[PDB]
Design a protein around this nucleic acid. Structure first.
Ligand code: ANP
Ligand code: MG
Length: 89
DNA sequence: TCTAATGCGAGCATGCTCGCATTAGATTTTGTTTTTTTAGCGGTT
């Protein structure tokens, strides 16, 4: 199923998501994986914010991913990481 | 580097221009023209 959360800048979408994930961490710390997919220059920020709960003070079930990092983990599981890769140069 | 002043003598109409040579001075730039894209690390050695 899909959910389109839409609103102008300042709507509170990101905090709404942060809080959603936090509550879902409260309910079941070992539940099914929760993937937070953000731009690469936004991975750390969210990681910090999720970690800022007096309740839990961290995350385990839920990770923050870039497209690249997500590719790294899923490929670590599924395979195909053997081949070397080429920098742009 | 070219323009101007200084000196001297020959031809002309004893004093005057003119030729020539030469040096010495001073006098002196302006201008303008771009952006290049494209998604932070890495826990474990
Ligand atoms: N319920 C709330 N009440 C007051 N301030 C809030 C609330 N939720 C979030 N904020 C603040 O609002 C600011 C922006 O929240 P955010 O979650 O980024 O909204 P947003 O929809 O993502 N805006 P944007 O990312 O620019 O499109 C932050 O400074 C939050 O601390
Ligand atoms: Mg936001």
């Amino acid at each position: 199923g899909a959910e389109f959360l839409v609103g102008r800048s300042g709507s509170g979408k990101t905090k709404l998501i942060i809080n959603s994930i936090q509550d879902e961490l409260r309910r079941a710390p070992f539940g099914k994986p929760i993937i937070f997919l953000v731009p690469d220059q936004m991975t750390f920020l969210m990681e910090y914010e999720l970690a800022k709960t007096p309740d839990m003070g961290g995350m385990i079930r839920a990770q923050v991913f870039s497209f690249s990092r997500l590719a790294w983990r899923v490929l670590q599981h599924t395979g195909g990481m053997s081949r070397p890769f080429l920098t742009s140069t």
